[PDB]
Design a binder for this molecule. Structure first.
Ligand SMILES: [K+]
Ligand SMILES: [Mg+2]
Ligand SMILES: [Mg+2]
Ligand SMILES: [Mg+2]
Ligand SMILES: [Mg+2]
Ligand SMILES: [Mg+2]
Ligand SMILES: [Mg+2]
Ligand SMILES: [Mg+2]
Lengths: 95, 106, 122, 44, 120, 354, 50, 51
RNA sequence: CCGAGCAGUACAUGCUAAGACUUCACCAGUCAAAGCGAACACUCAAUUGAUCCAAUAACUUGACCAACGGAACAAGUU
RNA sequence: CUGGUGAUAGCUGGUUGUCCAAGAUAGAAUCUUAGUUCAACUUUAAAUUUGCCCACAGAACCCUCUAAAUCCCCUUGUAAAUUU
């Protein structure tokens, strides 16, 4: 990670995180399952069913990806007809 | 080899524990505990709760299914008067299925 | 392997010779204990260290009163080798509101309610 | 469970089975039924 | 909407029912029982009673088994029982006496399969 | 560590010495019959009956019925054996039974059934519906006197009520026809109650018919203490049960305290408790017959609440408890995307301050 | 040996202390010592122990 | 023992429950202390002198 | 000290969805009520391999990556 | 020799005033075992309500049998515990 750029003097963003993970504005990170396109002929339908699911990340992994991206990806977006628009906020969450 | 680690299989919910539907009660390599009332069995002989309630372990008479050849062939050679026993795990439901409530006055 | 010790129930069954030896009475058991720690919790298992903290027996040679009930006695059966157990004696009865400032516990287990600090005239 | 009084309730192996002729009982006997008719030999 | 006792997959017979048809045939008599899952018997029909015995030449033949079902089905309708499960053994199911008993129950208006529980 | 058993072991009686000379089950049916016998006996260890079996009191239920009839067994057996011999004497009955073409008359069997063991089956059947549990708080009685009640539907058909059979309120809009065998000079008292029909007090019951001091079988001559009222089970409230109680009186009884105006369309006066009613009349009155049926809701129930009862018909619905979901966590690790939908109230988008 | 155990004048024995865990003595003892009662140490047997 | 297991049971449930409620009261009363305006103005006395 | 790097039977070995287990992390792995749609969560202790990339209209496929959490490709000798 | 050069070094050595407080020994992966990441443990702040000790009851048959115990766990003693 480049903490200070050599031309602008500001933190840079790792493009490996952006191409793999989706960040919800609430603070959660959504990822894919490693191996959902590999050797599907030997995997049971129940196993394949949970491979093609979008899953969240835990406390440590989410904080890791936050330090690897800049504030441009932590902003609130208002895309028209966004499939994940309803997932940017938490409801009935206590503590 | 022999570098294999333990599978962490055993009793997950003890006697008197409050469980919900779908909760796994016990994981086992073989049928150490047999499924009782409101208890299902998966592919890997995994016992899961079918109802929300309290888990109980009892000793019940084991009656094999007629199709099961190995278990039926075992009871045909038993001395007359002998009865096989095995440990069964039951879930006693705590809440009723539903209640009738007034919705309108027509 | 060193583990916890299960004391057989036969140990805590007083014989008739013991009642005339310590002065107890099985028909009228005492109500309260006087537990005093006389041994260090150092070099002892951690579970025995906790029970001493539960009973408020941190400082040694400091009397503490507890109730003669099976649950309290259950904890005492685990650290019985670190404490001295003595029944509480009440020659004048339970302390009253006017006797709270005049009580005194003697080494014999008697809790006197009139501590005058004066020689007996008898 | 072993510490429970109901230990060994599920035991069944001791109920399942795992020649010399003594002076009081015959060891092995073969009963031969020879006849020209097969029906009578099988029936007897 | 009443829950059935699911489970008992490793033993026989099952317990996932509200009512069960249990047929007991001894050396001399044949008896059929309709009992709830809790063990309570709702209605019964046996050849030991004089009412059925007085018309039966033999209480241990196929005719006796068939005649029990016709009387039992009549009593089930009066009692209000229309659905019950039957859990026979492979040899009992292939027997001619049980096939006619089941025929009498079906012709008597009783269904040998309970409707599925409504979960939602 | 080991602990001695608290009682005899299951297979302790089996002798392990002569294992070869012990008879085997040799079949599944033989083991199954023996296995069930041991399952019905109490054991010192935990059993399925302990937690799921219906708890019962050690005190046996008291009997408040009529004394059992007195029959000479020796005379009965001689005639019964003789009849079977004549039935077996016929060569046509044997051939018909051997050819599996014989059949018995259903009407004749029930005629003898109702006289010998009909009352006994009815007591067991009534116990299943909890009629003894609710009406008499567990007290039981054998219905020595058969009761035949049938509702008039039209002019040619009748709806018999034997025990708990389904009957619609439309068929029960009018008082049924009550027929029962009785001697002259005896006094009877009919009673019809709705156990589950009450809308306010679960314990209380609704009175639908009360006829007292009925002379013999002439039901019409009986005093009309409370006019007949058709059952009115609310819609969506399930299935109700109404029980016909047939009492036998030894001496004339005064029902001034239980008298109700004609007609009685007030549910507060229709409130009735069988336990308290029989409690103060048990001295000279004893139940003799029993009949009951199950009733659902139909369109005729709407007419009862609006016109007869002059009230709005209540509607009930079977409501299930909400599904269980664990406490929501800030980071639902490895949970699918649909995790957040389980804890969301509305399905419509929100915008906050925007 | 049985006579020696019966007439022994010492009120304190190995078996009594070991089973009752007096003075926390099981911390320096062995699980087998609850049954050996001090008569067996290692592979050696002491007949003089009661 | 003075009392048996059955007699002892439930004889201290009220006091035990009330003692823990006092723990909750102190635990959930944690808040920053009040900030007074007199304290801020008292620092002007560091330059107080004689006329 | 003995094995595994498969094979056989299915062709709903379809689609979805409560609640749980989890090889002490992660990754990965496992069980599963109900519902929809059909009929009247396959056997098997292990029987396996991530990302990038490449191929493909698409569905999908690709390593004795066996040093088996794998560097795209590098041995001796002083 | 000068410059890149303040090369790099999982290695060696060093790392400056006062006082108080809490504080030690499960593991997994790694061209990895002189390192590092994660977990465990430890620290601080915050929210919350149970935590620990533990009465019965309860946890398997086998290859025939067999130990100290452990899990679970109302009371009770106590004041910790979980979450962020
Ligand atoms: K490697
Ligand atoms: Mg884990
Ligand atoms: Mg490796
Ligand atoms: Mg690994
Ligand atoms: Mg350097
Ligand atoms: Mg310190
Ligand atoms: Mg490597
Ligand atoms: Mg507790």
């Amino acid at each position: 990670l480049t903490y200070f750029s050599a031309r602008k003097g500001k933190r840079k963003t790792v493009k490996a995180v952006i191409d793999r993970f989706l960040r919800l504005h609430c603070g959660l990170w959504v990822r894919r399952k490693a191996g959902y396109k590999k050797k599907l002929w030997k995997k049971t339908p129940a196993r394949k069913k949970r491979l093609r699911e979008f899953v969240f990340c835990n406390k440590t992994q989410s904080k890791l990806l936050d330090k690897m991206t800049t504030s441009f990806w932590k902003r609130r977006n208002w895309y028209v007809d966004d499939p994940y628009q309803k997932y940017h906020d938490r409801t009935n969450l206590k503590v | 080899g022999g570098k294999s680690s333990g599978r962490r299989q055993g009793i997950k919910k003890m006697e008197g524990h409050y469980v919900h539907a779908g909760n796994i009660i016990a994981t086992q390599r073989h049928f150490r505990w047999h499924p009782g009332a409101h208890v299902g069995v998966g592919k890997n002989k995994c016992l899961y709760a079918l109802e929300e309630g309290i888990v109980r372990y009892t000793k019940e008479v084991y009656v094999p299914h007629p199709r099961n050849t190995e278990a039926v062939d075992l009871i045909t050679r038993l001395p007359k008067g002998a009865v096989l026993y095995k440990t069964f795990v039951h879930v006693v439901p705590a809440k009723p299925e539903g209640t009738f409530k007034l919705v309108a006055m027509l | 392997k060193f583990t916890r010790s299960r004391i057989p129930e036969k140990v805590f069954q007083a014989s008739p010779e013991d009642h005339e030896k310590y002065g107890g009475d099985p028909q009228n058991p005492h109500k309260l204990h006087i537990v005093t720690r006389i041994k260090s919790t150092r070099r002892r298992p951690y579970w025995e260290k906790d029970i001493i903290k539960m009973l408020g027996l941190e400082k040694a040679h400091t009397p503490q009163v507890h109730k003669n009930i099976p649950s309290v006695n259950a904890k005492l059966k685990v650290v019985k080798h670190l404490i001295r157990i003595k029944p509480l004696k009440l020659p004048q009865g339970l302390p009253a509101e006017e006797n709270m400032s005049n009580t005194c516990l003697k080494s014999t287990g008697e809790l006197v309610v009139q501590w005058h600090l004066k020689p007996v005239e008898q | 469970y072993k510490t429970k009084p109901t230990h060994g309730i599920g035991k069944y192996k001791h109920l399942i089975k795992a020649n010399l002729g003594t002076d009081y009982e015959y060891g092995v006997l073969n009963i031969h039924l020879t006849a020209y008719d097969m029906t009578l030999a099988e029936s007897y | 909407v009443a829950r059935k006792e699911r489970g008992w997959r490793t033993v026989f017979p099952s317990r996932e029912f509200w009512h069960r048809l249990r047929v007991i045939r001894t050396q001399h008599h044949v008896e059929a029982l309709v009992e709830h899952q809790n063990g309570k018997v709702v209605v019964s029909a046996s050849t030991r009673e004089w009412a059925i015995k007085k018309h039966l030449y033999s209480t241990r033949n196929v005719v006796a088994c068939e005649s029990i079902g016709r009387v039992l089905a009549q009593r089930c309708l009066e009692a209000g029982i229309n659905f019950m499960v039957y859990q026979p053994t492979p040899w009992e199911a292939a027997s001619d006496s049980m096939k006619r008993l089941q025929s009498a129950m079906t012709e008597g208006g009783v269904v040998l399969r309970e409707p599925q529980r409504i979960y939602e | 560590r080991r602990t001695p058993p608290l009682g005899p072991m299951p297979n302790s009686d089996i002798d392990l010495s002569n294992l070869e000379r012990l008879e085997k089950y040799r079949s599944f049916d033989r083991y199954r019959r023996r296995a069930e016998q041991e399952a019905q006996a109490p054991h010192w260890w935990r059993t399925y009956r302990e937690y799921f079996g219906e708890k019962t009191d050690p005190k046996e239920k008291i009997d408040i019925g009529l004394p059992p009839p007195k029959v000479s067994r020796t005379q009965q057996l001689l005639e019964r054996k003789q009849a079977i011999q004549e039935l077996r004497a016929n060569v046509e009955e044997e051939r018909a039974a051997r050819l599996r073409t014989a059949s018995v008359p259903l009407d004749a069997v029930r005629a003898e059934w109702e006289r010998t063991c009909g009352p006994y089956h009815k007591q067991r059947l009534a116990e299943y519906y909890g009629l003894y549990r609710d009406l008499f708080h567990g007290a039981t009685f054998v219905p020595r006197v058969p009761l035949h009640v049938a509702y008039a539907v039209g002019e040619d058909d009748l709806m018999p009520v034997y025990c708990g059979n389904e009957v619609t309120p439309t068929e029960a809009a009018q008082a049924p026809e009550v027929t029962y065998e009785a001697e002259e000079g005896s006094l009877w008292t009919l009673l019809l109650t709705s156990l589950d029909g009450h809308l306010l007090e679960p314990d209380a019951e609704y009175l639908h018919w009360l006829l007292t001091n009925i002379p013999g079988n002439r039901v019409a001559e009986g005093q009309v203490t409370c006019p007949y009222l058709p059952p009115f089970p609310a819609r969506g409230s399930g299935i109700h049960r109404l029980a016909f109680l047939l009492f036998k009186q030894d001496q004339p009884i005064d029902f001034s305290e239980d008298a109700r105006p004609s007609p009685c369309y007030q549910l507060a006066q229709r409130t009735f408790r069988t336990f308290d009613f029989y409690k103060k009349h048990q001295e000279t009155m004893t139940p003799a017959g029993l009949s009951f049926f199950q009733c659902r809701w139909d369109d005729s129930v709407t007419y009862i609440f609006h016109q007869l009862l002059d009230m709005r018909e209540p509607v009930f619905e079977f409501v299930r408890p909400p599904p269980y979901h664990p406490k929501q966590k800030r980071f639902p690790h490895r949970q699918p995307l649909r995790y957040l939908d389980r804890y969301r109230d509305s399905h419509e988008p929100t915008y906050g301050i925007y | 040996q049985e006579e020696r155990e019966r007439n022994n004048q010492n009120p304190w024995t190995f078996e009594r202390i070991a089973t009752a865990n007096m003075l926390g003595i099981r911390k320096v003892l062995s699980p087998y010592d609850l049954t050996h009662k001090g008569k067996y140490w290692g592979k050696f047997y002491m007949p003089k122990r009661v | 023992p003075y009392m048996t297991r059955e007699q002892e049971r439930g004889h201290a449930a009220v006091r035990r429950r009330e003692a823990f409620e006092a723990i909750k009261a102190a635990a959930t009363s944690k808040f920053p202390p009040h900030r007074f305006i007199a304290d801020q103005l008292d620092h002007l006395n560091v330059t107080k002198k004689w006329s």
